[PDB]
Dihydrolipoyl dehydrogenase
Amino acid sequence: STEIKTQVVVLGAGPAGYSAAFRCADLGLETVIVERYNTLGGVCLNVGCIPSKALLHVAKVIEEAKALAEHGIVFGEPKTDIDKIRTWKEKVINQLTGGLAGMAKGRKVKVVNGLGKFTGANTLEVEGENGKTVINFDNAIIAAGSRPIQLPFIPHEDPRIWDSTDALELKEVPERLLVMGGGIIGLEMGTVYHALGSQIDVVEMFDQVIPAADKDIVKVFTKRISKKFNLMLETKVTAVEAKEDGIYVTMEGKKAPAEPQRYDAVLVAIGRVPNGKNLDAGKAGVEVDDRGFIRVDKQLRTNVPHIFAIGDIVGQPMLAHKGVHEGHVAAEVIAGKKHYFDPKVIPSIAYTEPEVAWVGLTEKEAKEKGISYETATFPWAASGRAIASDCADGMTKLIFDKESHRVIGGAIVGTNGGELLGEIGLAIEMGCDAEDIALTIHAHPTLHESVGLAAEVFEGSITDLPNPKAK
Amino acid sequence: STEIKTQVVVLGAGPAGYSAAFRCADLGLETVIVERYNTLGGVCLNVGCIPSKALLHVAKVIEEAKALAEHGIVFGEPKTDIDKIRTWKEKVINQLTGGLAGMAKGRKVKVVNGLGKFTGANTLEVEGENGKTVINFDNAIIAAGSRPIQLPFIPHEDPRIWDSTDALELKEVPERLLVMGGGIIGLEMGTVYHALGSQIDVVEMFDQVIPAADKDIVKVFTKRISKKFNLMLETKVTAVEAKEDGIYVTMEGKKAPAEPQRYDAVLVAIGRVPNGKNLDAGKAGVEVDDRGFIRVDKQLRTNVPHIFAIGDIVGQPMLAHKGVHEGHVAAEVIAGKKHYFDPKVIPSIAYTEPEVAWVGLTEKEAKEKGISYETATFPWAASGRAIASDCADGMTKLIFDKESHRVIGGAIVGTNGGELLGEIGLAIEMGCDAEDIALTIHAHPTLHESVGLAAEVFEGSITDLPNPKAK
Ligand SMILES: Cc1cc2nc3c(=O)[nH]c(=O)nc-3n(C[C@H](O)[C@H](O)[C@H](O)COP(=O)(O)OP(=O)(O)OC[C@H]3O[C@@H](n4cnc5c(N)ncnc54)[C@H](O)[C@@H]3O)c2cc1C
Ligand SMILES: Cc1cc2nc3c(=O)[nH]c(=O)nc-3n(C[C@H](O)[C@H](O)[C@H](O)COP(=O)(O)OP(=O)(O)OC[C@H]3O[C@@H](n4cnc5c(N)ncnc54)[C@H](O)[C@@H]3O)c2cc1C
């Protein structure tokens, strides 16, 4: 065995973890990062956002190429080699995980391979293949992330029952695939496999996919994917049978078929739960809650002043950008700076086609916390760029506080829609009002000028559309 | 003949004109718009930005499809029908011009077909097929736009010598095409024709394409298109001969070939000049300058208090978004409101592949008006989204004022790069400083988060990069 000592040890090397660690190094702190897997970057880099975007990019080009056929460019069908696609994806990932190790070396952050668990309130041991390493620390940042949900009546040991990780290994292209969960992750994998040939069924208990998004926004999305997928909303999987020739799924609800359906694979994309209970947090005084989260305060302090928690392990939303930013705050706080983590806004994007992107308050949220608001919408059907890009069903929506006229939220549905959120997130943060946005000159013809036009709709000054607001 | 009377007559129905007209109608003014061609929307809609986007979209998918070949999706070569591509383009345009007429009717803006010229300081006649219509007006908005430059030693009567209009009719795919002018318009048509098969030569007097954009930005662009085009910088066309088997072009300068080269067509994309001298502006008191522009003030007043000018006919930049905004100000001013047109920022975008987009001060501009500044760059090679989208050469650049820390400019080179300008234009308008941007949470993985990352580079807080700034 062996024993070492530093100021800061970080547990987990996803976006939250290594962000904190690198920020610690840069603030002149002595840092060690503990990670159980062979590479850094955690879920996001290895089995998450990045691999997903690579496959989604491929799926998009395929679908866009095919659409050109009726305009005079006929590619015919792709000859496809999933093994090479898989190799590309692995190349993209390895490039980035290399950079991460590289930068970890440049910042002299020691990396330790093992599963780490808390010994005492100042001691953490990692049992990695290497040996038993005991770590003595002044400060600890817990960043151990989350994992996919499993149901108990489901045969999760059968290789045809997939979690997201399995979907992204791109083992095969199932002829008929069931997606359990009309959430973001599930809808994205649906998009990938449909491009590659799979027939897609989605089963969702709620009455709309992407439950958190507004109704009008998801209405546009749904009218788009219901052409591609078989959507079974307000419907529920009651039984799952592993048979030789398939997975037999029995459903009940509004769209349930009478008989059990046979599928070649089933992706269970129900959600994710925190890894809070697996660190022996108890043995360092840190309190885990019932659901698995390690609750923290504006400074990312656990109930143990010198032990911090960041990322998915801390609560919704389980998004990468959240983790990074909390990681920075947590490092800065340890390094003495008086900083706090409280963003008024956190963006969310579904990178389906069309994309569904939103930030700030949704109508639902305001309609519930009793905020009085007005919305303004610009439909892409009136957008030169959108028509010319053959993506003319989409809308940009801004949500204003009706007496301050301040922008409190925004949403997009459309191709490359997610790239419009930067402007909206910035405006909310800066306290912009409709006039500020409307009078900013937006390039023509872009999609993002729809943001400014939405504002003009509010101001009742818009000319690119019939204008009922003024006389 | 026939004679009519209204409060406002608008001359020209491009983006500036119909914007002004529609804004006038909405402000309760009696408006007539005069346009010489059969459809509304002017150059931008009919032979400009829209047709260009349509063809550019097609070209992009073609190039993106072809690149998938080395990843496991092999489409092989497209069977192409330029006549159908042409029909598509004409469909996209007709849809939008239909909407224009429609909205013109809904706003009860009378449209008059003819070439209009100024009779007196309150009287304009239009000679259209229809007849002779004399128009008596209280106010006139001049929005007659610009036209492409022609050189005099060039045989412009030869159908193989093209302006942009000719390029966009997509008559044929020349085997060998010469683009005169490494400006935006020229570089974009090069991109279209290369996708459809044309061999491309560009000849540019300056030492870089897109002269106005920063060196470091265009460096990245150039290293990309120099793989596709034959770039002849610091080179000049001295002669052009119409022969049976081609157009023989003689060049001199740094990259000039010894002998004249034979080309199947030559696109002359040197620039555009104002239509200021063709309206008999003289006969209404309006003064035209030497170069063709109708100079105006912060309110878009000509030297004749009740006669306004908007759009290309007024000065650089000759961009559609400028025209629209001025058109609104001009209408509002006429309707009594005390409004002014002075934006601190006007974006520019080349919709090539990769895109080159910039807004606010460039390094050049500041290095000349003696502003002391610092820049921050984020290279896309470090971008997960960019790598995963197979577009990993690109950079986002923010230019800050070094004592206010305010953002004064920004530029992007990369795929869909133009959609990132909205955020940057807004921040400059709002007077944001690097911290405001850096602390705004940007979605991961998007391209636009490179904006926030560039700011973090400036703050010296960035962790997605080796950070030099912090010890
Ligand atoms: C399919 C999919 C798609 C996604 N797409 C997006 C997206 O588009 N945008 C977005 O923002 N987010 C996306 N996410 C969510 C995102 O990946 C997570 O929010 C993010 O990875 C959380 O990072 P983290 O640092 O908190 O945890 P993780 O990335 O989970 O990192 C935790 C690390 O700690 C390690 N670890 C755990 N326990 C121990 C132990 N005790 N000892 C040593 N090491 C340990 C784990 O191995 C892991 O590497 C996606 C997720 C999935 C699954
Ligand atoms: C190939 C190309 C690509 C372009 N791409 C972009 C781009 O991506 N982004 C961008 O912002 N801009 C782009 N532009 C520039 C943009 O098209 C112009 O800035 C815009 O059209 C200017 O609009 P306007 O109303 O000022 O003038 P115009 O669009 O030129 O409209 C003037 C109208 O007045 C009419 N007219 C002129 N004289 C008379 C007469 N005396 N009587 C009656 N009618 C008359 C003309 O027929 C015309 O319809 C592009 C231009 C070209 C050529």
